Design a binder for these strands. Structure first.
Lengths: 144, 214, 102, 148, 135, 67, 71
RNA sequence: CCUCCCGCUCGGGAGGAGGCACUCUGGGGGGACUGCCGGCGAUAAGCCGGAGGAAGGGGCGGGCGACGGUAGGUCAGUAUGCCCCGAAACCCCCGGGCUACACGCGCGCUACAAUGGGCGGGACAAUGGGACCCGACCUCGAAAGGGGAAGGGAAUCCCCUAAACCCGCCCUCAGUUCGGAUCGCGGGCUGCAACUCGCCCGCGUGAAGCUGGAAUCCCUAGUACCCGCGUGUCAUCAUCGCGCGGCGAAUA
């Protein structure tokens, strides 16, 4: 009795990111946290969680949207770069963490490319989620 | 996060910021009764527009009054989650939005030590931080006096809260006193009339210089 | 028959409505089924300009409006029942577009 | 823990503090804050812990990822100088190589008689434009590189 | 059952609300009232729902869609409409006058929203002049 | 700052109570229906004012002193 | 604190304005405290003060005043 | 009614049929006028206070600036009296100069951190602009960008992601993980061409500055204060000019 709609995004994301360690099809490739990262990072973190959140979002976003592109998910993160004393401006993420991620989901059978030119959920990506949200929404009533 | 939702079940019922019942306190003086919005309810942000009328600013939730005289210091420069600031100051070179957090954490840090309803420690800090007498360099008839002028209950509150909000930013200055703390350690000691409140040191001096001159 | 769209825009308010009203009145009675004259947006055009040619002291700055309004009309009639209705005089200064599909 | 010290020596005899490993190397000229976290991976340490909690065995794993970083991994835009003086493929920079390599290329230009080398001697930015009145009220940029 | 469609508008957050009978549904832009991150502007929405009671909150399905920029903006458009959604429901002057005595941001919007940025004498913001120092 | 009704507005309501005094009332809208039909409606906002003054000019004509 | 003596006085009428900064507004006050009761004093009241507001008088022996006037 | 998921079988969510209800779009109409009620005022004008009401007593914000003057500003936009130039004070060209600096000031941006930084997640707009032009989406590239290619001359497609927000996690007040000058290098992009003199991306470099004297400016409410957003001109120099919405006051 739950969708991704019913669960707050702070409790959903460590429950799907674990369920991306456990299953265990999607994994961190070594080249992606090392130095092929998104724009500028004050520090680069050596995290599995880092990879598992950038993908745990990707299964929530393709649920909501239809044709969700690479240029959309690069620009959807939120984050900047310095120019100098000129004030900062809005730039997009690293396309390397987004174009390997959709393709690690695509081999897992969670996402599929539609024939209209775009990106949509499969039933296996849609059920992996509704089960993880049925577990989260059930726990949110137990806990005062 | 679960306590956070208990803080959403609890303000509902009714209580300020998630867990402070607005009945715990009373305004014992009949002076500060119509000038204070202790009695009404739930959220400061409100956006109820004030100064609209003659006293369109007396009905302002005590805490909202706190938030925007705690928000005050601010020019030009640019804030966003980027690298990015300061721009929101040692007192909101920016919004009542990230202001309201400071006052909430300062209600949390003043509750943690005193253990009372903090709206009984702050309303006990804005009846003591206000001086009862002030001298204006007032001349009338071309004749320069420096005179006995007594203070009105509305202009009391304002000098109470402002001197509370002016004292903390001298201490928070590039110091571990966080405003959530530096305010929470000002609000306890203005409630007490302690010798450590830069807000009860002007209260006194403004009455004492004003007694000499009268 | 052939569903035609009359897409009719004009730069001023008084000129566009008289034609839209007259088009819905003459077409009403003959071999035409007509869907009502629907108003789409004003793509109000702002030109925002410096008055003073010195650019000096205070210079007061003109705000400009060009408002272009678009009525749209679907119609089920022939290509011959279309010209009969396109007889009308039309303000200067009123663009009338015609797409033809079955 | 892995045996507390307050001063372990890393990168020769130059000192590693007790701030955090990623900030203790930034100081060591040549290793920054992004390049420090590239050599924490290959070596196999926790990045966010304090500096000085290192046995003798960790201090050897870092000194050989420094001598040649292009052997271990470290991409050819993620290493310190790539394509050096037209014939070195990639190298490393440290407090002695960085100090020499930048004064060398400056020693090169002054002999060349360019508008870059004599523009680093008179007291000026070359491409930053204004020398019109900036570094104002007697002031100075300090050009390259250190007044602390 | 019933369908009573209302509106609630504050600083151009337009809330589209519907009040039909059911089982305690609170829908905001498709997501339960639970999805919001600020605790704060939630409590604002919650103000009217207790002033009347949980009795009528539980017995009625409220779906709202607030298309408005502000986080507090959305909340505020949600505070005005629920209150108007609950005064149309029961019908009495008891629930209307009880809201008005508490605050007028439940049943009045604004008379004003925003002002244009004036042309000005070459600076930034509607109400500002270039700095002077020629005396 | 300060409020005062214009002299065009008073010239007009004064002669409009002069010609047809008995076809005017102490309701706002009715006079407003009549003012519409007698003199031009250059607009809507002024058409409420003249009408606003005419009503006051019927309240004073009962008193005995009308200026 | 110790009291002093709080000598509550509620204002009866607001005569006009004083101060060159304008700051004082002279208000006539009537007393409601346990010692005197009733006394009519013309005190220098600052800040926003309506008719029927309360003002805690610090000293009971005062009455500074300069008067005129509307035409 | 129909396809998909989930389920404690109570019930939550999307698609398409279907439906113009709602938001909205732009054309028209009503509503506020001291009309009524009290007080002050010459029973007049007007000011104050009150009720009903979405809104009130110039409702609120613009455009709208008389006769003239400072011999204000522009003949270097145009129009134009007078004078002057005539291989030239013309004309064509490349290159350099306007972007030189020991310094002085004006107007601004960015900034001196815990109301903080990283990382992640989630909830939100509006004006506008878009054919050698906006560019879905797919692919390669760490990225800047490149390759392919749908739609769009526009409520129907694209720029587009708002930003501030909040919640959890790491970090634990130093000239620093602040701050970003200066310098080495690798690399893209436009044009014939960016050394002089472009911007961005990555790594290394990592300067002054730790709340500022005398003095002085701006503004009175959806305003200031604050946060991003667009457009003009336009390849490219924007810390500018014009304009939009988000948070939302002090004192009068």
């Amino acid at each position: 009795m739950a969708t991704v709609y019913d669960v707050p995004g702070d409790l959903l994301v460590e429950r799907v990111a674990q369920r991306l360690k456990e299953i265990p099809e999607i994994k961190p490739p070594e080249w992606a946290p090392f130095v092929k990262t998104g724009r500028h990072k004050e520090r680069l973190p050596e995290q599995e969680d880092w990879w598992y959140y950038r993908v745990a979002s990707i299964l929530r976003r393709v649920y909501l949207d239809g044709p969700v592109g690479i240029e959309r998910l690069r620009t959807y993160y939120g984050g900047r770069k310095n120019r100098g004393h000129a004030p900062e401006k809005f730039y997009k993420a690293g396309g390397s963490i987004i174009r390997k991620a959709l393709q690690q989901l695509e081999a897992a059978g969670f996402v599929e490319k539609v024939p209209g030119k775009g990106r949509v959920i499969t039933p296996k990506g849609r059920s992996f989620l509704d089960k993880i949200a049925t577990e989260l929404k059930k726990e949110l009533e137990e806990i005062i | 996060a679960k306590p956070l939702n208990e803080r959403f079940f609890i303000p509902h019922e009714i209580k300020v910021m998630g867990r402070w019942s607005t009945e715990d306190v009373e305004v014992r003086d009949p002076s500060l009764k119509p000038y204070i919005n202790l009695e009404p309810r739930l959220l400061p942000h409100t956006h109820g527009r004030h100064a609209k009328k003659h006293f369109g600013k007396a009905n302002v939730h005590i805490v909202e009054r706190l938030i925007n005289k705690i928000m005050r210091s601010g020019g030009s420069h640019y804030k966003v989650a980027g690298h990015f600031m300061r721009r929101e100051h040692r007192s909101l070179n920016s919004k009542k939005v990230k202001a309201y957090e400071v006052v909430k954490e300062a209600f949390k840090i003043i509750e943690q030590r005193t253990g009372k309803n903090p709206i009984q420690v702050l309303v006990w800090a804005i009846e003591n931080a206000a001086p009862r007498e002030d001298t204006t360099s007032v001349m009338f008839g071309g004749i320069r006096y420096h005179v006995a002028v007594d203070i009105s209950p509305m202009r009391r509150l304002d000098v109470a809260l402002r001197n509370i909000a002016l004292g903390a930013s001298a201490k928070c200055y590039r110091n571990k006193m966080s405003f959530a703390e530096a305010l929470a350690e000002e609000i306890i000691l203005a409630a007490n009339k302690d010798p450590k409140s830069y807000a009860y040191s002007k209260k006194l001096e403004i009455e004492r210089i004003a007694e000499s001159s009268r | 028959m052939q569903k035609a769209r009359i897409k009719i825009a004009s730069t001023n308010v008084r000129s566009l409505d008289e034609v839209a009203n007259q088009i819905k009145q003459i077409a009403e009675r003959t071999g035409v089924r007509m869907s009502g004259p629907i108003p789409l947006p004003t793509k109000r055009i702002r030109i925002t300009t410096r008055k003073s040619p010195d650019g000096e002291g205070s210079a007061t700055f003109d705000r400009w409006e060009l408002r272009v309004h678009k009525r749209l009309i679907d119609i089920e009639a022939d290509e011959r029942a279309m010209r009969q209705i396109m007889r009308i005089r039309v303000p200067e200064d009123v663009t009338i577009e015609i797409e033809l599909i079955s | 823990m892995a045996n507390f010290r307050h001063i372990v020596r890393v990168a020769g005899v130059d000192l590693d503090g007790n701030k955090q490993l990623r900030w203790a190397l930034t100081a060591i000229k040549g290793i920054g804050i992004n390049f420090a976290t590239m050599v924490c991976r290959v070596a196999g340490l926790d990045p966010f812990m304090k500096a000085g909690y290192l046995t003798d065995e960790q201090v050897k794993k870092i000194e050989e990822i420094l001598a040649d970083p292009v052997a271990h991994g470290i991409p050819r835009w993620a290493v310190n100088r790539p394509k050096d003086y037209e014939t070195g493929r990639d190298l490393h920079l440290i407090t002695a190589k960085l100090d020499m390599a930048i004064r060398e290329d400056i020693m090169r230009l002054r002999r060349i008689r360019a508008y870059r080398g004599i523009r680093h001697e008179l007291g000026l930015p070359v491409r930053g434009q204004r020398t019109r009145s900036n570094f104002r009220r007697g002031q100075t940029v300090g050009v390259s590189r250190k007044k602390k | 059952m019933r369908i009573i469609q209302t509106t609630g508008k504050r600083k151009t957050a337009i809330a589209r609300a519907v009040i039909r009978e059911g089982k305690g549904r609170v829908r905001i832009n498709g997501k339960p009232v639970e999805i919001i991150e600020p605790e704060i502007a939630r409590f604002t929405i919650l103000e009217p729902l207790i002033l009347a009671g949980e009795e009528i909150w539980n017995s009625v399905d409220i779906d709202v869609k607030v298309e408005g920029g502000g986080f507090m903006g959305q909340a505020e458009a949600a505070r005005m409409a629920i209150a108007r959604a609950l005064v149309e429901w029961t019908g009495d002057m008891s629930l209307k006058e009880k809201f008005m005595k508490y605050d007028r941001t439940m049943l009045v919007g604004d008379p004003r929203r925003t002002e244009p940025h004036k042309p000005n004498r070459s600076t930034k913001g509607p109400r500002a002049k270039r700095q002077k120092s020629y005396r | 700052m300060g409020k005062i009704r214009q002299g065009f507005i008073k010239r007009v309501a004064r002669e409009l109570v002069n010609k047809y005094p008995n076809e005017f009332t102490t309701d706002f809208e009715h006079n407003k229906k009549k003012v519409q039909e007698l003199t031009n409606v250059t607009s809507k906002k002024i058409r409420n004012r003249i009408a606003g003054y005419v009503t006051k000019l019927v309240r004073m004509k009962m008193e005995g002193k009308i200026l | 604190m110790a009291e002093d003596e709080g000598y509550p006085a509620e204002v009866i009428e607001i005569i006009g304005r004083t101060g060159t900064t304008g700051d004082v507004t002279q208000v006539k006050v009537r007393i409601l405290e346990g010692r005197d009761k009733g006394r009519v004093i013309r005190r220098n009241v600052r800040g926003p003060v309506r008719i029927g507001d309360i003002l805690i008088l610090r000293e009971t022996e005062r009455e500074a005043r300069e008067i005129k006037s509307r035409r």
